[PDB]
């Protein structure tokens, strides 16, 4: 469906803090 | 209408067909 | 009881609600009375819980005429700081009664106008369409967080690529709502020594005194010095209250009045021509007379008296696009789904069975052809064997009310005779039972609305006569013993059925014959008209607006016609048939193996046949057009046909499309589901049996007077009319098109200009599969409002909405097409969305927007100078010199052995940590994990201060006194490290305070600020004081106080695309919506 | 793509799709490309639906 389909482009790149 | 529905229900029971020669006269013809 | 209508009445009070339909003063829909018998019929709506001996409205009818008491605006001010302040004059004193002094404005600190969709207000049917606002200092971003970004990794941001979407629907939302017409509701006189002698308006409800103060700033009076009594000084005072009412009334109050009140001129606007918009709906009941007078074709007069009067609204007037495009909408329901089609024609069948005067009686085959008969003794007779396929039942005749039912829907199915009543394997002319069973498909042929019948009766006989005569082709794989049911498509004509001259009567001396018979004496089309044109419109696609397209010709009608007429049609081709299967028979040419002699037999019973007595020829040549004229115009789903032709091949439609793009532009070939049929449409399978028996049998009562029967038939379909909730239903789908086209124009790349207003707030390129999300949020918020449960704009939404304009097209055989396009009218919601998007250019700031960017950067100091409105002397742009725009390839490189670290400007240089910089907003979007890492420790501490580039934001405040310390790095931070890829936290601020008395001068620290002028949502400061000394000051905003101030103003003006005022004239209605009455008379 | 993990496959198909914040050599190819080739750039929509 296109609400995973846009979900997982947008969560393929995302960044986190540090350790 | 309850009382009415039977007043239609003896006019649509006396309209019936005077005329029943809807079966087969051929049996009668070669009588005749 | 009554004497207009002749109703008998019972109770005085039911006489006083009864004359009140025909307008005389003392739930219905429509209320019908006859004329010759005692019935009345009246209409009431579906949705009721206890229905009880009445009619049901089933349509999905629009909520138009909806009213509204109570304030006629859409700002409000709310205090956001309360203080209270020493007070030198306290009340006023009449005699020993105190009455307190009540301020039309909130008595604050910092007053601001927010936006609440109507905030006070009396209403029989809310819209349900609020755009409802809190104030600035709590969270607004569920506004912003609505359309689009329903999968957002932060769900307290908003899409930064969807604000255009998101405002676009807001303001759908505001030109949706405020869609009443005000009523008027009874005033009160003053004699307040500061409002002497002017009636004024009072709401309905518990207590009328309420809303006095909030409604008219002139009423308090100038009792102390403060912010606004010696704005009450500055104001005028014969302008208050009721300006000019009617001159026509009813008991003692007038039609309509014109009253000074609070307002503001974007609602008084959309309403004003949301009233003008109704009002050219308004028609009259001699209009209605004449409507239904003429639509139903004679054989009934009604009427429709009433009284003089002008504030009677009955809209039911629209324009024959109008009429069309719903049409357009209607056929692309469809989409080859035979569900949305069946009830239709199943229920259009049971009403022309139940209408009509024919019984189709079983007796007259019986009474002729006799079962019993047995020529041969070997075999069955001819006369016992077409009875065993005739086989007179009573079962049902469906197969031929069908059948005349899809006269009138020609563009979307096709009546074709089933396969399987054609004769099995070919058949062959030696066989008995084929000859009947090409009899009886011949013969329930001509009534299919399949164009290449004529070709299927030929090709029937001429692939049975295979091995006793040749006839030429053309082809070699398309020989003559090709089945008949094959030939459905005009391609497939054969030459030699084409030009007859090919077919030698020496090779073929019965073909010729038939082929000529084709050719003479099949059906000719004709047309007869039908409804109203000039009122009620007309859907007519393709053809002019009042003709009704039959295959079959007629006559006018009477009785007492003789039955053998060879000059009706039907009739004609009965006997021809009938005399081409006598000479086929009379030789033996044909037919070996017969061992007796049935060629007496076969040529009585064909004789039979065709002197067989039956008045459906009749019937179907002189009653039946009539009664298609009779019910075509009421109907939901109005005729769609398309033309037709006896045997022209050059014009045979074969393809039918509905067109969504423009004209003057080359997109992508969007070719519509109807077009992917082998026919002109949906097919649809028919019985030739029953077809047949219907033909050959059926007769009238023997007392049957058309207008006794017509009249009485009539009237109870007419009291159950649904024409006028349709005619009121298509103004909505219209619109709703053209404002679909309006809109998403705006969000999209579409080559269609219209005005485009706003462009500074930031959006993207959108898709179709981002547009379709956008209409379908669209189309949702036009049914919630208009109450509908049922179809609108969900056609549209089946791939790439982008579209410009409805059109609708065939194609003939060859290659001429027919373009219709209805031209597009004058639509209302779309330019009073535009009109509030011209207004939303100037105000931005009232809904929660502010313009330009944000710099980011250590302001410490002690002034007071609140970051809504900065001095030129912290901002830059791209023009001051010394600035380092930069593009998207910013990286980071890390000094080495304590050097700084710099970063790419975007002309290749590297620059450090250090000065007057520039971001657009997607970078800190790109790398907001790295970035913040590396800016963070630089922005807090150092030198370094950024604009960044984003067009709109929304915003929320903090306010703190300026006699303490404060720091904005708490909530800089907070805002900094939330910014995710997708969203964006609303940008906080803070803004100081404003005090009457002097204060303390205490250092503060400031980060967030904005670059343009921002401060105009906020109404004004320190309300009660005299002056402001420290803090930004405000007075009462004069320049919306215009009929105030302006001793030279006439009161309509408005200053609308620059600001909108808040007190102007606003003319309240007192209208009636009566039912529909008639009284039908019967005619001699 | 259709399968367990799409989430993984978008960094594998797109590599100017990243962001560009380095001065690595990842970062050092990537900031030195063209935009507007990703994705779908041709299509034939010969029916609607
Ligand atoms: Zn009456």
């Not at chain 3, 905030?119 to 569920?142: G, L, Y």
């Not at chain 3, 005067?357 to 064997?385: G, K, R, Y």
């Not at chain 3, 091949?649 to 070939?669: A, F």
């Amino acid at each position: 469906p296109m609400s995973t389909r846009i979900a997982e482009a947008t969560s393929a790149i995302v960044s986190k803090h540090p350790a | 209408e309850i009382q009415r529905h039977i007043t239609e229900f003896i006019s649509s029971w006396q309209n019936h067909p005077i005329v029943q020669v809807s079966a087969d006269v051929e049996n009668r013809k070669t009588a005749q | 009881q009554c004497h207009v209508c002749s109703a008998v009445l019972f109770s005085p009070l039911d006489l006083d609600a009864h004359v009140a339909s025909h307008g005389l003063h003392g739930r219905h829909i429509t209320e019908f009375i006859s004329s010759w018998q005692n019935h009345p019929i009246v209409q009431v709506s579906a949705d009721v819980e206890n229905r009880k001996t009445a009619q049901l409205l089933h349509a999905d009818t629009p909520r138009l005429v909806t009213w509204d008491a109570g304030l006629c605006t859409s700002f409000k001010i709310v205090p956001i700081v309360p203080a209270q302040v020493p007070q030198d004059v306290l009340a006023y004193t009449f005699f020993t009664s105190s009455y307190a002094i009540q301020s039309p404005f909130p008595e604050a600190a910092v007053s601001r106008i927010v936006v609440h969709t109507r905030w006070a207000s009396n209403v029989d049917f809310d819209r349900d369409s609020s755009v409802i606002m809190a104030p600035p200092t709590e969270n607004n971003i569920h506004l912003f967080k609505q359309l689009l970004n329903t999968e957002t990794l932060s769900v307290r941001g908003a899409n930064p690529l969807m604000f255009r979407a998101n405002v676009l629907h807001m303001l759908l939302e505001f030109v949706l709502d405020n869609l009443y017409l005000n009523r008027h509701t009874g005033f009160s006189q003053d004699h307040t020594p500061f409002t002497e002698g002017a009636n004024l308006r009072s709401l309905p409800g518990p207590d009328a005194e309420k809303w006095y103060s909030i409604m008219y700033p002139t009423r308090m009076g100038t009792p102390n010095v403060s912010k606004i009594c010696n704005f009450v000084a500055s104001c005028v005072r014969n302008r208050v209250g009721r300006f000019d009412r009617a001159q026509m009334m009813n008991g003692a109050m007038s039609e309509w009045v014109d009253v000074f009140e609070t307002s503001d001129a974007l609602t008084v606007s959309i309403r004003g021509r949301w009233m003008a918009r109704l009002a050219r709906m308004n028609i009259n009941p001699t209009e209605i007379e004449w409507a239904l007078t003429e639509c139903a074709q004679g054989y009934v007069t009604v009427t429709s008296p009433y009284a003089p009067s002008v504030n009677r609204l009955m809209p039911y007037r629209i324009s024959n696009a109008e009429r069309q495009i719903s049409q357009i909408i209607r056929v692309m329901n469809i989409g080859n789904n035979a569900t949305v089609i069946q009830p239709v024609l199943q229920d259009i069948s049971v009403l022309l069975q139940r209408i009509s005067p024919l019984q189709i009686d079983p007796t007259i085959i019986s009474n002729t052809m006799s079962t019993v008969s047995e020529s041969t003794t070997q075999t069955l007779s001819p006369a016992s064997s077409i009875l065993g396929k005739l086989r007179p039942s009573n079962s049902d005749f469906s197969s031929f009310r069908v059948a005349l039912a899809g006269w009138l829907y020609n563009g979307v199915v096709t009546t074709v005779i089933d396969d399987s009543s054609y004769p099995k394997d070919g058949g062959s002319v030696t066989s008995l039972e084929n000859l009947w069973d090409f009899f009886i498909l011949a013969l329930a042929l001509p009534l299919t609305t399949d164009p290449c019948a004529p070709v299927k009766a030929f090709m029937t006989l001429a692939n049975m006569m295979v091995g006793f005569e040749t006839i030429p082709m053309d082809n070699q794989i398309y020989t003559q013993s090709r089945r008949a049911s094959a030939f459905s498509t005009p391609h497939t004509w054969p030459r030699c059925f084409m030009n007859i001259q090919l077919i030698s009567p020496i090779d073929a001396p019965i073909l010729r014959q038939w082929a000529e018979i084709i050719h003479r004496y099949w059906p000719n089309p004709s047309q007869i008209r039908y409804g109203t044109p000039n009122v009620f419109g007309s859907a007519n696609l393709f053809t002019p607006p009042e003709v009704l397209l039959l295959p079959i010709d007629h006559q006018p009608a009477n009785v007492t016609t003789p039955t053998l007429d060879f000059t009706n049609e039907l009739t004609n081709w009965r006997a021809r048939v009938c005399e081409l299967m006598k000479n086929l028979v009379d030789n033996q040419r044909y037919q070996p193996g017969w061992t007796q002699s049935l060629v007496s037999s076969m040529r009585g019973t064909l004789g039979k046949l065709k002197l067989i007595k039956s008045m459906t020829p009749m019937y179907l040549q002189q009653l039946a057009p009539v009664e298609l004229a009779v019910i075509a115009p009421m109907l939901p789903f109005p005729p769609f046909q398309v033309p037709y032709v006896r045997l022209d091949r050059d014009r045979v439609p074969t393809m039918v499309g509905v067109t969504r793009q423009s004209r003057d532009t080359i997109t992508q070939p969007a070719l519509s589901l109807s077009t992917t049929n082998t026919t002109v449409g949906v097919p649809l399978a028919l019985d030739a049996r029953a077809i047949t028996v219907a033909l050959l049998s059926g007769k009238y009562p023997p007392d049957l007077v058309t207008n006794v029967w017509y009249a009485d038939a009539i009237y109870p379909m007419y009291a159950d009319t649904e024409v006028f909730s349709n005619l009121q239903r298509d103004v909505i789908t219209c619109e709703a098109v053209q404002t679909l086209v309006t809109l998403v124009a705006q969000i999209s790349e579409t080559q269609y200009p219209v005005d485009r207003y706003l462009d500074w707030i930031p959006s993207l390129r959108a898709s179709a599969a981002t547009a379709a999300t956008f209409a379908e949020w669209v189309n949702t918020s036009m049914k919630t409002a208009f109450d509908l449960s049922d179809m609108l704009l969900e056609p549209l939404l089946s791939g790439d909405p982008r579209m410009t304009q409805l059109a609708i097209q065939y194609q003939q055989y060859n290659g001429r097409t027919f373009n219709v396009i209805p031209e597009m009218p004058g639509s209302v919601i779309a330019d009073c969305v535009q009109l509030t998007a011209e207004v939303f250019n100037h105000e931005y700031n009232l809904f929660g927007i502010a313009r330009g960017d944000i710099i980011i950067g250590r302001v410490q100091s002690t002034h007071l100078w609140s970051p809504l409105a900065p001095p030129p002397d912290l901002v830059f742009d791209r023009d001051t010199p010394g600035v380092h725009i930069f593009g998207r390839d910013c990286r980071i490189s890390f000094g080495m052995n304590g050097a700084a670290p710099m970063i790419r400007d975007e002309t290749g240089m590297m620059v450090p940590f250090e000065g007057n910089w520039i971001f657009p907003l997607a970078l800190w979007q790109m790398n907001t994990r790295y970035f913040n890492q590396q800016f963070d420790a630089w922005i807090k501490t150092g030198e370094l201060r950024i604009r960044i580039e984003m067009g709109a934001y929304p915003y929320m405040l903090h306010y703190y006194d300026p006699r303490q310390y404060a720091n904005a790095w708490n909530l800089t931070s907070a805002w900094l490290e939330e910014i995710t890829p997708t969203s964006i936290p609303s940008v906080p601020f803070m803004v100081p305070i404003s005090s009457d008395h002097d204060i303390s001068s205490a250092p503060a620290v400031q980060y967030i600020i904005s670059t343009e002028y921002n401060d105009r949502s906020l109404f004004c400061t320190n309300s009660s004081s005299p002056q402001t000394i420290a803090g930004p000051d405000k007075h009462i905003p004069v320049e919306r106080y215009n009929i105030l101030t302006n001793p030279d103003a006439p009161p309509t003006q408005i200053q609308l695309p620059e600001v909108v005022d808040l007190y102007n004239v606003v003319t309240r209605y007192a209208y009636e919506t009566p039912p529909i009455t008639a009284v039908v008379m019967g005619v001699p």
